[PDB]
């Protein structure tokens, strides 16, 4: 896409505020500050039409060597998207329903660009990050969390389905956490986002201004591979680490983590809830009864259609490509505008501000949906009316090229054991040495060895429990 084509595709449609996003350029650093603190920097049409030209333009030059996206306020980075407006437009006939589909087109176009960006992309998660704000960071190789970070996807509560590229991400995460975070719409605060795996680094909010100054000093050579450029930044972001809290323990770990892998491995919501009921039932061996009971209360308070549809793509999104995912999500989200749950949930929650009581999904509960009925299939059939989404480029892949910057997950610990003879204590030192003192590596690796590691041959060797 040339400058003229891009500039002509993102024309400043009437109503676009002039200073929605604030751009700045230092030496080697290009920044993008979402300037809408009143509404928690909520993404919308006007905001997306100002970022796409810049990102495309900054990708043609070799001067811009580091891209940084951040929020303007001190509470939120990008809390959701313009869900409220979509609902109104959806209630004005087909002409108004296609406007919403066009908005999702822009968002997916941007997310794909950020994911297939040819330059280092950093995102300061200094504040709550939900909905649209989850699409500007997850696909980046550097996602800096802070004390104020609050991660969640409260989209299944409004009838919608997590879709800012989540289908590519969540599936390909360690364990069944990705579905859990989507279906349950859990709330992760502070360092828990770092341990979970969403974020790559964890710095204090006060040390972000001094990080930008350093990122500007970095001047890479034109012959350095994309890997080298990322390595330099990764080592630079670790220079400002103040250390994870001393008291806060891994939230989703140990028992709770094991319970997630035992209740989020099936392909039917009915089976999943059936498993949770067992854990909730007193005397369960797991010891997660409290968590189990609490989880059910939240699962029985969301649109049943979204649950079925959401879980459906978690199993199908593990094989799609990033480019194919966005194209499908567009058609997928286009049918949600015509659905009744979405138009109802949004209006009854955000619009009404919770007045008139709880929302009223078209199916009252999962029990109403008979077993032999599959409602998921209908959405996963692109219609000819909605044209296929046209991305800004052709770059694609099956798995994230450089998503190794974060804390070691099960995939890393597993690989290490299958290529070495480390012990219980000697294996931890291996990862602490390779990462040279990354905060939380000793704790994270220890947790992995407390869930999928057995003392098969004593202290001499360590093997996985699966076998």
């Amino acid at each position: 896409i040339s400058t003229q084509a891009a500039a002509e595709l993102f024309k400043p449609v009437e109503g676009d505020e002039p200073e929605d996003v604030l751009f700045n350029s230092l030496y080697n650093l290009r920044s993008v500050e979402l300037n809408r603190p009143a509404k928690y920097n909520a993404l919308n049409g006007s905001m997306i039409r100002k970022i796409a030209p810049r990102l495309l333009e900054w990708e043609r030059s070799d001067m811009a060597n580091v891209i940084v996206i951040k929020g303007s306020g001190e509470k939120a980075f990008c809390a959701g998207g313009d869900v409220a407006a979509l609902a109104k437009q959806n209630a004005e006939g087909p002409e108004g329903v296609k406007k919403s589909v066009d908005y999702f087109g822009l968002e997916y176009k941007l997310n794909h660009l950020i994911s297939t960006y040819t330059r280092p992309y950093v995102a300061f998660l200094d504040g709550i990050t939900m909905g649209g704000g989850v699409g500007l960071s997850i696909h980046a190789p550097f996602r800096i969390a802070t004390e104020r970070t609050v991660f969640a996807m409260p989209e299944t509560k409004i009838g919608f389905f997590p879709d800012v590229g989540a289908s590519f991400f969540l599936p390909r995460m360690p364990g069944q956490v990705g579905p859990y975070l989507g279906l349950t719409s859990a709330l992760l605060k502070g360092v828990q986002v770092y341990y979970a795996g969403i974020a790559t680094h964890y710095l204090h909010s006060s040390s972000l201004p001094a990080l930008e100054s350093r990122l500007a000093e970095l001047t890479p050579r034109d012959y350095w591979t994309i890997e080298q450029r990322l390595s330099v930044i990764n080592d630079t972001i670790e220079e400002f680490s103040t250390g994870v809290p001393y008291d806060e323990n891994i939230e989703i770990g140990g028992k709770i983590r094991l319970a997630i892998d035992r209740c989020f491995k099936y392909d039917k919501i009915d089976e999943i809830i059936a498993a949770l009921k067992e854990e909730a039932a007193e005397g369960a061996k797991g010891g997660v009864q409290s968590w189990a009971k609490n989880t059910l209360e939240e699962l029985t308070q969301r649109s049943p259609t979204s649950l079925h549809v959401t879980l459906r793509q978690m199993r199908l999104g593990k094989s799609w490509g990033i480019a194919h995912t966005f194209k499908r999500e567009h058609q997928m989200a286009a049918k949600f505008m015509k659905s009744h749950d979405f138009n109802e949930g949004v209006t009854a929650l955000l619009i009404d501000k919770g007045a008139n009581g709880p929302a009223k999904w078209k199916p009252a509960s999962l029990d109403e949906i008979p077993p032999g009925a599959n409602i998921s299939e209908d959405y996963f059939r692109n219609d000819p009316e909605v044209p296929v989404l046209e991305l800004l480029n052709d770059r694609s892949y099956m798995q994230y090229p450089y998503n190794k910057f974060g804390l070691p997950n099960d995939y890393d610990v597993k690989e290490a054991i299958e290529k070495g003879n480390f012990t219980r204590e000697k294996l931890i030192d291996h990862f602490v040495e390779t990462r040279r003192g990354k905060q939380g590596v000793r704790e994270a690796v220890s947790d992995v060895l407390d869930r999928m590691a057995v003392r098969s041959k004593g202290t001499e060797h360590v093997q996985w429990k699966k076998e």
């Binding site: 900054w58 030059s61 001067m63 811009a64």
Partner: protein
């Protein structure tokens, strides 16, 4: 540097005269400068005159001198091009050191470079003596058959020579329309017309017609050219 062999000069002569090929094509074919191709024809024409008038040529001197200079026989056995046919004069404006501050992501092209050097300057794409080559090379980038690429080249060059001849024809025909030839008993008076009001705004103009008033004879100045400057 090598010199066109005797047999080579004839090949260039026959191509232009017998086959009536455009000079630009013959130059691009054998990698010979258009200024040299035109000279070989002029020199060869004089030879035809000498042979037609039964004049003795300097064959003993020609053969002896040709063995002391490197030669480039054209045709089948062509190893290297005779010379560069794309040399562009280094204009004085283009020799300056200019670092123009532009946007970090700007696509600065030769067109923009010409405008930075000056306002009336052209890019090197228009200063070539055979500009049709660029158009011919653009066809090879579009996977156009070589045979058709040469066809377009010939037509382009051939069409260009027609325009040049037309302009030259109109010019000479328009220059003879201003001259009135009045034959007399002894001579033929040639009265040329011209606008007597084109003397600039202060009377000083280079292309004016008349002996200037207010100038003393400069015969006493140093380095005063008093020799013919051109032979027509």
């Amino acid at each position: 540097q090598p010199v066109l062999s005797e047999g080579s000069r004839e090949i260039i002569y026959q191509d232009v005269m017998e086959k009536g090929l455009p000079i630009k094509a013959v130059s691009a074919k054998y990698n010979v400068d258009v200024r040299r191709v035109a000279a070989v024809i002029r020199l060869k024409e004089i030879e035809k005159r000498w042979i037609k008038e039964y004049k003795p040529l300097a064959r003993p001197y020609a053969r002896a001198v040709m063995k002391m200079l490197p030669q480039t026989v054209l045709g089948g056995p062509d190893q290297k091009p005779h010379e560069s046919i794309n040399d562009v004069h280094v204009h004085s404006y283009t020799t300056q050191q200019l670092f123009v501050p532009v946007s970090e992501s700007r696509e600065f092209t030769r067109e923009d470079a010409a405008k930075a050097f000056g306002d009336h300057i052209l890019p090197v794409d228009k200063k070539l003596r055979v500009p049709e080559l660029i158009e011919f090379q653009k066809d090879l980038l579009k996977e156009v058959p070589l045979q058709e690429a040469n066809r377009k080249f010939l037509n382009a060059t051939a069409a260009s020579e027609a325009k040049i001849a037309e302009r030259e024809a109109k010019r000479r025909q328009a220059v003879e329309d201003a001259i009135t030839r009045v034959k007399t008993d002894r001579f033929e008076f040639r009265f040329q017309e011209f606008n007597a009001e084109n003397v600039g705004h202060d009377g000083r103009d280079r292309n004016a017609v008349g002996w200037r008033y207010g100038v003393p004879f400069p015969d006493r100045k140093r380095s005063q050219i008093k020799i013919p400057t051109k032979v027509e």
